Symmetry: C3
Subunit: 307 residues, 3 copies
């Protein structure tokens, strides 16, 4: 029953099977998903290595029939090289700000509703991505090229068979972030910045962990388009008791000077094993009459198996 890699010294296969039931106004939606991933690494010498990575996400939307479900999202497709000076990759990979949004994104299902990341800062293709650790300072960066297109003699996009010349879409950008870990103390701070076409943002964050408790704060500010502001605040707390972890978050965002998210959420997660867990979560959506839909609370129940 023995499984081998064709060419590598080794291959790590991972991902999840994650059953998720969402209840809003007593009505049920299946938000379940599978992820499959493949990680290969080639040691070159004891200070240099090559890496390759894929991850896909697979869902269903039957709507009451045994349908054919052709739903795939290639979340990551990259190769890279790393070693003494860090790691650099090309192809769809994470920008710089995810490690900052992680300060307050601690829940099983809810949270992360007021820390919007633009593409170059989040996860996107046609991008070089860098990371490295220098003592207690963790750094990330990315640079994204604008995407080549083909245009007619008037400059409109057409098929390469019938085009006059190449142009591009102006979607270049970059991101940067740093995190300082204060020795063994449990304290971290973080910051980052990103810029792409008419969008820019910065983030600042801090956190503390001590034994069975955790808390953290996050501030996000910038512009999602020309003269369209965005500002967001999140706070987070966590408590561990045996194999159970309980979390709460408060998230608040405004967009174009109007409240766009306002949510307090709490959950309980039970770890039967490190890779098998159940959870239940409730999000109080505190926007007023926002339409009724935009304001509905959410109950979520789940079971998560990690491969």
């Amino acid at each position: 029953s023995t499984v081998y890699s064709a060419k590598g010294t080794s291959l790590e296969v991972g991902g999840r099977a994650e059953a998720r039931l969402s209840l809003k106004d007593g009505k049920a939606q299946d938000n379940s998903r599978v992820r499959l991933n493949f990680l290969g690494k080639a040691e070159i010498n004891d200070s240099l290595y090559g890496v390759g990575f894929y991850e896909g996400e697979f869902t269903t939307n039957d709507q009451g029939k045994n349908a054919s479900n052709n739903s795939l999202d290639n979340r990551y497709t990259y190769a890279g090289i790393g070693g003494t000076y860090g790691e650099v990759t090309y192809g769809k990979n994470d920008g710089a700000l995810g490690v900052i949004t992680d300060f307050t994104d601690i829940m099983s299902y809810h949270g992360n509703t007021a820390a919007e990341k633009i593409a170059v800062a989040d996860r996107v293709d046609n991008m070089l991505a860098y990371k490295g650790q220098f003592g207690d300072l963790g750094v990330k960066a990315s640079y994204r090229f604008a995407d080549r297109n083909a245009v007619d003699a008037m400059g409109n996009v057409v098929t390469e068979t019938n085009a006059a010349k190449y142009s591009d879409n102006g979607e270049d950008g970059y991101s940067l972030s740093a995190i300082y870990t204060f020795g063994d103390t449990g304290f971290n701070v973080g910051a980052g910045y990103a810029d792409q076409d008419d969008q820019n943002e910065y983030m600042l964050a801090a956190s503390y962990r001590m034994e069975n408790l955790y808390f953290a704060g996050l501030f996000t500010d910038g512009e999602l388009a020309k003269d369209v502001d965005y500002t967001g605040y999140e706070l987070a707390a966590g408590y561990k008791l045996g194999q159970a972890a309980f979390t709460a978050t408060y998230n608040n965002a405004e967009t174009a000077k109007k409240t766009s998210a306002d949510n307090f959420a709490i959950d309980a997660t039970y770890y039967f094993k490190p890779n098998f867990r159940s959870y239940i979560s409730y999000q109080f959506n505190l926007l007023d009459s926002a339409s009724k839909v935009a304001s509905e609370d959410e109950l979520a129940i789940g079971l998560r198996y990690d491969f």
Copy 2:
């Protein structure tokens, strides 16, 4: 060349590569397919475990060119928990009646043409599924929630950005089945029921196995819509001689009081190994002038490798 699971104690990778040539009126169609699956299990204690499962189906339809083939069907996406009282899952998984249709679904390619299962009884998402064994009695059940949707102030389906309130599609339902195995004797009986919106059905079945022979009967009856009956009958026989297994079935169904299927089929399957087999099969389609297409016989030839 060594392959590891990222987080699990173990991972089982399975599926098939199955070459299938279909001939009708001397004209060939490629019905070949690949299935890939991933099964993870986490032992919690010696009476409790967690489970996660994915399976996809992958085909081609070139029609004479070297085409790009984007054909995927996520057949199963689920997690569950089981142990002393049985197993329960959420996400796309089997309803109760497949283990009943299996009494007569014994051929490599043909058969199973007069035992139609509705969605909640077959395989569908937004569904809790249960199974367990109590002595010689095997039981299954499922319950399906209706699917949440979003509607305008007049109650028509629209995008959640522009909706007034949540509603649903009324596609709730349930299924149940039981199978009794009569000790070591080779005798089994089975029954089940399913109900969803305007559809309901029941099934009754029996089978006998003794050494190199097998035979079985199946009866299906109910409604596929309001005042639209469905009744189906199947009989099956099987004979094993060395590494070859030969099967024959007769299947007959009526729908809205008219004959909709009438097929006698026979095949031979040779097991070179437990996981590599060839087959040939012929289906006599006995409907009269039904159009010519609806009445054509089918010859099928195949080769099946299981991973």
Copy 3:
């Protein structure tokens, strides 16, 4: 962390993660891709075996947003049987001429621009494929059935529910090739032929390898439609120095009596390990004013991890 095959004695998992940056007129396109493959083999006796194979290709096209990327191509889906007299498969697999085009297709990214293969000769479904080695002679062949369709009483394609009779698309064809290896000398010659509907072609090739050097020639000639000629020429050279391999090719094709490709290209590839390599490549496109687009040079940079 242990990974097993469900039913096989063993399973080989392979493929690649391949980062590729393409630059034309200073404008960047992400041509990166992942391939995943699964190869199973069942030994029957010491002169007979069964085989099953899948391979998929997975890409992204974000165009500056963190998009959902549903891009899959099932490149191979087949099962087969082989042993003393060779191997035969059915389902999407290679026709006969790829092993001939390989004489001059030696670069990491460029080359293979003037050796066009028709479907039955390239890779296509509804096809039997054969290969075998008889002393120093390597042979391949394939035969493709025309694809069944369903037509109305006037002979137009419609759904099988509403059709009168079955017809087909006339897309039958075959291919054949042979390669003679002259003992230990480093010399090979090759030839092949293919025919499908209104297309036919032949190929002739020769190559020499000696130590750190390689060179080769390829000639292709035939018709891509009724009274639409195609002729192509390629030359190739290769030099290895430590872990670096350098290649150059010249490719020239005419179609309907006009020059359709004219490219000289050169590259360098560094093998850090057998399964991890970087490359850089430049293609001089020598067509004149062809539109500007059709004539642009290409710089390509890459990193390739093989699983």
